[PDB]
């Protein structure tokens, strides 16, 4: 009888807007604005200065969520950050974010790793903590500086990912926002989307650059996204026709249009930011959520479906009554 | 109505047992001794993975051993949470790699959580929450580290202290409590005193990818919070410190452990101690000690176990588990 309601949203993009032309010139390896749009639907993305970290981005998005929620920062008793580019090996980004916000209440703070499905994982976890009574007000973040793990000699991937942060404040409520979530993983497909390295004795071992088999990822993606959306919708006792807004992970326009069509929704019911944001992994969904809440598309009482896939393979979905 | 019960435990140490003398001789080609390390820490040995052996490799063996103890079908595990701060890769997650190593084909959720040396408490509390609600039924919960990868062997303060290893539990929905309660906390204002302050950026390491620590500040913080969080967790499980049959702290060093135990008013013989042989294996610490003490018959069904630790963050947490 306790539910998690969205009190506020916030987001942030770092100031360097990098257009397709900017990127094509940079490599000039051969690519173009036309080629990138045809492949992905992306026109621009945003890169942090290499000096600026995931928690920096997270801080500003959180501040803006806190403002929308209109709450005392000291009332946030849980922070979960979904990221795959944390500031440090340890401690966690959430811990750094806690201190940046000046929160002194000793509340739990941790990071979760499910890559581009990270925010679904983070939402479902917070929701579970709030529903049980254990926490009351959670700050849930998706944040990435994916420019730090891009190989700019690889046009397959380096024109695809961007940086950014999005945040939501969830609070105990007698009335549902978060109705249901479904999370999944299949580690047999780890090889087709991976950044296969880490630090070892001071030096990088393996490759600390993102690699991807785009064709395999696409087929897997469309295959699971349909199923998990249905499972989630069933778990929330809702039908596809009752979805007022679809917010997929902003991977690329064609995976997004496919999913939306397979659900039988009209394309006008889907929030699309990939064109301006690119693929910001865990940040993707809460960026789009924030944009669409703040521009008045998403209204109180409406049913929102978030879903995505990511490295792992992982995938997950949530049905949220805003 | 639904509780999480421990069906089985398992653990693993890599084969290279590194004694204090082995390590002293090593840094003598670089300064320390067996006596200095024992006096400081209570440590006599620790175990190092080969540099080509990863956290998920260690996790695999510990998990298999839990699965064996649980006596369940591997395909029935519908949740995998790994606590680690030394995952195999930037991504994907260790839990995903572990899933495939175990040949689990049921598409269950798999993810990693980061709370450093408090990781296992964080992981247990998250799994517990998922099982209690009905969302998941059988969870594999891992603490696993290859902390040798982030040690500076020119720093005698820290490089004699940490080790590698993995420990695992299977939790399952039950009408009778094992996990009675958990309390988790964090204070990021103390991030600077215990940190590995770097990461990868454009192919190279930026910052320092080596663990640093202000031992004195960590100790004082540790003893201060461990007493409080134990009590909070015990209250939340409707128990008192005198109802604890076994205390299993994060195996940081013998003196923080003895302090905590005394401050709870327990005798020292009610505390499981593995630091001497395992060293500080961060998130792997508690489930290593859990496994050792379950399998040598100390921890018996029906007994109340308190697990408690602190780590980088600062983070800390506790759990009260009726075995």
């Amino acid at each position: 009888t306790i539910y998690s309601r969205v009190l506020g949203t916030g987001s942030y993009l770092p100031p360097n807007r990098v257009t397709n032309q900017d990127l094509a010139k940079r490599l000039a390896i051969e690519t173009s604005d036309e080629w990138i749009v045809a492949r992905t639907g992306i026109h621009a993305r945003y890169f942090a200065e290499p000096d600026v970290t995931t928690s920096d981005l997270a801080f500003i998005a959180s501040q803006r969520a806190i403002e929308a929620a209109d709450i005392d920062p000291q009332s946030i008793d849980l922070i979960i950050v979904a990221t795959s580019t944390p500031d440090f090996v340890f401690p966690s980004t959430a811990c750094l974010l806690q201190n940046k916000l000046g929160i002194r209440n000793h509340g739990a703070a941790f990071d979760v790793q499910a890559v581009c499905s990270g925010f679904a994982y983070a939402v479902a976890t917070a929701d579970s903590f709030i529903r049980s009574g254990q926490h009351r007000t959670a700050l849930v973040i998706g944040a990435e500086t994916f420019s730090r793990i891009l190989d700019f000699k690889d046009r397959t991937t380096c024109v695809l990912f961007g940086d950014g942060a999005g945040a939501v404040i969830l609070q105990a409520s007698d009335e549902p926002g978060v109705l249901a979530s479904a999370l999944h993983a299949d580690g047999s497909h780890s090889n087709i989307l991976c950044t296969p390295g880490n630090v070892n004795g001071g030096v990088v071992s393996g490759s600390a650059f993102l690699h991807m088999d785009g064709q395999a990822v696409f087929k897997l993606a469309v295959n699971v996204l349909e199923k998990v959306a249905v499972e989630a919708l069933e778990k929330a006792n809702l039908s596809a026709e009752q979805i007022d807004w679809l917010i997929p992970h902003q991977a690329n326009i064609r995976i997004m249009q496919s999913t939306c069509r397979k659900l039988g929704l009209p394309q006008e019911r889907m929030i699309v930011t990939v064109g301006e944001h690119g693929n910001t992994s865990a940040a993707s969904i809460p960026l789009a959520l924030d944009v669409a809440v703040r521009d008045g598309r998403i209204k109180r009482g409406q049913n929102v479906l978030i879903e995505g896939v990511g490295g792992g393979f992982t995938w997950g979905a949530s049905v949220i009554r805003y």
Side-chain angles (χ1 to χ4, degrees), chain A residues 1-20 22 24 26-28 31-33 35-152 154-155 157-174 176-190 193-202 204-214 216-233 235-253 256-261 263-267 269-322:
Chain A
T1 62
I2 302 183
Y3 294 87
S4 301
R5 186 145 210 181
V6 166
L7 277 193
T9 69
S11 73
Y12 179 73
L13 293 154
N16 185 22
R17 187 183 185 265
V18 180
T19 68
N20 278 5
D22 285 340
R26 188 160 150 182
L27 310 195
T31 189
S32 85
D33 177 55
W35 189 78
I36 292 173
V37 169
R39 184 171 193 94
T40 71
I42 303 178
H43 294 85
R45 79 293 287 147
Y46 295 74
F47 290 159
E49 298 304 317
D51 166 50
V52 174
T53 79
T54 291
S55 93
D56 287 340
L57 305 191
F59 179 53
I60 298 155
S62 293
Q63 271 182 322
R64 294 169 176 183
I66 289 160
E67 287 163 3
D70 191 15
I71 58 170
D72 177 0
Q74 304 307 315
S75 73
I76 295 156
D77 57 60
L78 179 56
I79 298 175
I80 300 177
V81 169
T83 190
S84 185
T85 52
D87 302 31
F88 301 138
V89 163
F90 76 79
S92 68
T93 315
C95 279
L96 301 173
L97 176 58
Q98 201 197 58
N99 182 52
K100 272 170 198 210
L101 290 164
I103 293 163
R104 294 309 327 209
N105 63 23
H106 295 168
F110 64 109
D111 296 357
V112 295
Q113 170 65 306
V115 204
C116 306
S117 310
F119 189 73
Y121 270 76
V123 174
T125 302
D127 189 41
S128 184
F129 286 9
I130 299 182
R131 282 186 136 296
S132 72
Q134 292 288 310
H135 290 275
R136 162 147 195 291
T137 307
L139 179 61
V140 180
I141 305 295
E144 314 275 15
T145 42
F146 254 44
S147 45
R148 295 172 172 246
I149 59 186
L150 285 192
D151 185 355
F152 293 92
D154 172 19
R155 76 158 190 184
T157 59
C158 92
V159 293
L160 206 100
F161 300 96
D163 301 339
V168 189
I169 295 294
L170 292 166
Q171 198 176 71
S173 170
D174 68 3
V178 183
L179 286 168
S181 301
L183 304 175
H184 289 289
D186 189 344
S188 71
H189 298 305
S190 57
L193 176 54
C194 59
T195 303
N198 214 343
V199 314
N200 194 349
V204 173
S205 73
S207 220
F209 287 134
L210 188 156
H211 126 59
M212 182 188 95
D213 181 336
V217 163
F218 198 103
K219 173 148 155 291
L220 262 200
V222 178
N223 171 337
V224 297
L225 284 175
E226 86 204 336
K227 305 190 196 233
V228 73
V230 173
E231 178 190 6
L233 285 164
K235 283 173 100 171
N237 192 35
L238 282 187
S239 67
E241 228 294 285
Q242 289 173 301
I243 295 308
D244 297 294
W245 297 103
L246 180 62
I247 310 182
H249 173 237
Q250 312 281 311
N252 59 86
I253 202 49
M256 292 175 63
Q257 288 176 334
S258 184
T259 302
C260 183
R261 150 172 348 95
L263 281 167
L265 293 181
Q267 301 289 334
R269 272 195 222 173
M270 177 171 65
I271 302 311
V272 178
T273 52
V274 74
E276 182 64 15
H277 293 187
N279 181 345
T280 58
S281 193
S284 184
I285 286 160
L287 266 151
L289 178 55
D290 186 51
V291 172
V293 162
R294 288 176 182 261
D295 71 11
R297 277 176 288 177
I298 298 179
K299 305 161 206 89
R300 290 289 182 184
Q302 284 186 319
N303 299 319
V304 179
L305 182 60
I306 66 170
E307 43 141 53
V309 312
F313 225 53
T314 52
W315 58 106
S318 273
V319 186
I320 311 182
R321 180 162 301 137
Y322 172 58

